[PDB]
Write a protein that binds this ligand. Sequence first.
Ligand SMILES: Nc1ncnc2c1ncn2[C@@H]1O[C@H](COP(=O)(O)OP(=O)(O)O)[C@@H](O)[C@H]1O
Ligand SMILES: [Mg+2]
Length: 204
Amino acid sequence: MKVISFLNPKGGSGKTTAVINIATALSRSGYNIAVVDTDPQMSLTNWSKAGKAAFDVFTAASEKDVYGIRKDLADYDFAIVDGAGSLSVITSAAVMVSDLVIIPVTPSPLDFSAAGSVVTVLEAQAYSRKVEARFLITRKIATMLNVLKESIKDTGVKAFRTAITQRQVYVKSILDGDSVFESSDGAAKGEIEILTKEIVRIFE
Ligand SMILES: Nc1ncnc2c1ncn2[C@@H]1O[C@H](COP(=O)(O)OP(=O)(O)O)[C@@H](O)[C@H]1O
Ligand SMILES: [Mg+2]
């Protein structure tokens, strides 16, 4: 059983969109996936209500639910935590039980600051058990793209090779209650797929 958490208190980092699609790609690979929504706005929970999720969706009522994910979702291959906002406990709880922390970040310069709060938590965790961490560029298109790439290197945490390109298909699919794999967008499905293999490769 492995836990993957998408953390970044900043809203609009692209956590839910990534989670929904990467979780779906993992299912397509034959893995049993459990996703836990920790956001109060329940973006993912509501999306799943459409009934098209290719995995199991859970809605956390508090940090307590995150705290007991290892035991609760122990029968799944992967348990993905869809990060919250202001509730900083969620981040600490997630990091504490995660095997892979992914930090979705956009090229927005004035938004990288929030992603750093997660790194601070990671560094602290390192004392107990260093958890693999990766930055993930989302809503990719630039110069600020390069500046972001340098700020990331300063954190000591590497970024995934594949970035989530900004595409309407990501917005529409979630809106229709499904993922990019329910569309005919090969490029979109492709990067999500390649990205999903970089995740799997990290575990292998
Ligand atoms: N890869 C993407 N391509 C196009 N728009 C995106 C992408 N990722 C996120 N967005 C847009 O930005 C918003 C924030 O994404 P979301 O996954 O909800 O973020 P968090 O998970 O940051 O709340 C979406 O509602 C959508 O409008
Ligand atoms: Mg979200």
